[PDB]
Amino acid sequence: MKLIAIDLDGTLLNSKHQVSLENENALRQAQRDGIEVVVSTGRAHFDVMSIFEPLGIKTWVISANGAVIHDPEGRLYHHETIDKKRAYDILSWLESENYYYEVFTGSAIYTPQNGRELLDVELDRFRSANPEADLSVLKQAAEVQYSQSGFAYINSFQELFEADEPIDFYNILGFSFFKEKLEAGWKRYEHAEDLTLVSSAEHNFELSSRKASKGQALKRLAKQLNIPLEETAAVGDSLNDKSMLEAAGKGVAMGNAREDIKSIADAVTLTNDEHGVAHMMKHLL
Numbered sequence: 001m002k003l004i005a006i007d008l009d010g011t012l013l014n015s016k017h018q019v020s021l022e023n024e025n026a027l028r029q030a031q032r033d034g035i036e037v038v039v040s041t042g043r044a045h046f047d048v049m050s051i052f053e054p055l056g057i058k059t060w061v062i063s064a065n066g067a068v069i070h071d072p073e074g075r076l077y078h079h080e081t082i083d084k085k086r087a088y089d090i091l092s093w094l095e096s097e098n099y100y101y102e103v104f105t106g107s108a109i110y111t112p113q114n115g116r117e118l119l120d121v122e123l124d125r126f127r128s129a130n131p132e133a134d135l136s137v138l139k140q141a142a143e144v145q146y147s148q149s150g151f152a153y154i155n156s157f158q159e160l161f162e163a164d165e166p167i168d169f170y171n172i173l174g175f176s177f178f179k180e181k182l183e184a185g186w187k188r189y190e191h192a193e194d195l196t197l198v199s200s201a202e203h204n205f206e207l208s209s210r211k212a213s214k215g216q217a218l219k220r221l222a223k224q225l226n227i228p229l230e231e232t233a234a235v236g237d238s239l240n241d242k243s244m245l246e247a248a249g250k251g252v253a254m255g256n257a258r259e260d261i262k263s264i265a266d267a268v269t270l271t272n273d274e275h276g277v278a279h280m281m282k283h284l285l
């Protein structure tokens, strides 16, 4: 393998959202072996930096569900935006229908939700990745995570359009505690050919442009680095990782991965908590 793509939540991160010593060592060893390491997430580039900066970790970063790509030093390689009229349409619908939502842009993550609501969205991420984890451990970690968040409050999505300032829309996360609302959101966009529809947790769905997906971003990067897809591997646990496992020469599912992700994988590693990423590096590739 010459390139390895690694999902962030539920994969590189354990249930306390830490990068274990084992995983950090595995990442550095891979870079030491001359392997290009890429971390791929639906979150913002700055969310990844907040975790990596203190650890001195520098990898390629695919963020906003494949809408954005940065190199190890933070140089921008690509930004794939959602057409503004389509973004307006989506946000107007989400807000009018009472969905919690987060708008990933260049500057920050805009949202009208309050702290409790935003924490609920995050807790859902934690619980979906590790359903077997103690709720108290997950909540404490979710709070630490939120405390390092980079949200910007807005009264209405309208504020993101009624201003004469540049603002690009990369990924839109929609959330609802209700199964009926989640199904309605999925049905509404599952056939939209100008968009990419995925989910990163049991109670959310994410919308990015058609050409913005973890798999397409991986292909885009591999091509630029002159690395054949046959020489690339991707590992993840959640539904939004499906496209990159499919794109990679070798798709790896985390031990705590969703059943559909394990189903399409060529290999399966340990859970995120048991350092599955490190195990894959040393015992699967």
Ligand SMILES: [Ca+2]
Pocket (backbone or CB within 6 Å): 007, 008, 009, 010, 011, 129, 200, 236, 237, 238
């Ligand atoms: Ca994940």
